[PDB]
Amino acid sequence: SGAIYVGNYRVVNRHLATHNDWANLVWEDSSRDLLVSSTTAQGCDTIARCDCQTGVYYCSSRRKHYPVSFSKPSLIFVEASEYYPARYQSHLMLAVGHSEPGDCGGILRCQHGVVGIVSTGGNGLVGFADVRDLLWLDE
Ligand SMILES: COc1ccc(Cl)cc1OC(=O)N1CCC[C@H](C(N)=O)C1
Ligand SMILES: [Zn+2]
């Protein structure tokens, strides 16, 4: 679990969005595993606008943060799960690091701000849904 709170927006994994997220829907994209809902309170986070390929992520299944080197956002094949059929997920960045399904939502940050959230993983890999291209999150 986990979310980004920026301005009057809440960014979550689409597969973990709540009834309240869908009732306050701003934008969603199944191919990216992202959903953004509106909030009444002003949010705590800053979005990075950069090309960093290193950063630190939070891993809830270890209660720890880990440094990572990750690939640029790209189209990656993701196996079927209970949430989606087998498909290509876009804007996904992969790195070597521990993750389990419940780690989805953990934030990846660089020195500039929030880069994205955990969205996929397995066998010593962790994948992050990028949010740095969503320029409207800041206006
Ligand atoms: C961090 O996620 C995992 C980590 C390890 C393992 Cl073995 C499996 C993990 O589950 C996943 O990769 N997915 C399940 C939920 C939906 C995801 C998606 N974005 O399509 C894919
Ligand atoms: Zn950066």
Swiss-Prot record:
Q: Please give the superkingdom of this protein's source.
A: Viruses
Query: Which reactions are catalysed by this chain?
Result: Selective cleavage of Tyr-|-Gly bond in the picornavirus polyprotein
Shown portion of the complete protein runs from 869 to 1007 of 2193
Q: Where is the active site?
A: 15, 33, 104
Q: How does it assemble?
A: Homodimer.
Residues annotated to bind Zn(2+) 1: 50, 52, 110, 112
- What role does this protein play? Cysteine protease that cleaves viral polyprotein and specific host proteins. It is responsible for the autocatalytic cleavage between the P1 and P2 regions, which is the first cleavage occurring in the polyprotein. Also cleaves the host translation initiation factor EIF4G1, in order to shut down the capped cellular mRNA translation. Inhibits the host nucleus-cytoplasm protein and RNA trafficking by cleaving host members of the nuclear pores. Counteracts stress granule formation probably by antagonizing its assembly or promoting its dissassembly.
UniProt name for this protein: Protease 2A
